[PDB]
Amino acid sequence: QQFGRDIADTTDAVRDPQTLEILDITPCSFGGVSVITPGTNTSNQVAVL
């Protein structure tokens, strides 16, 4: 086995060809950004989730 796959079809692991050691692959940190605003009428201050 060369490259693993999870319950979905994404690749979660790969075998190092040169060192024959297994590496878990995790896609780099990501997410959604939500902006909490009191209203531009009130203030321009925001919070970030």
């Binding site: 999870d6 319950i7 979905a8 994404t10 979660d12």
Partner: peptide, 29 residues
Amino acid sequence: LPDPSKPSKRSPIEDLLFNKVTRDLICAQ
């Protein structure tokens, strides 16, 4: 009635209801 001893503070019936209803799937999605 809520059960104070248990941390969730749920009733026994509520705890049974919560137990019955149920790379991870969530992680992949």
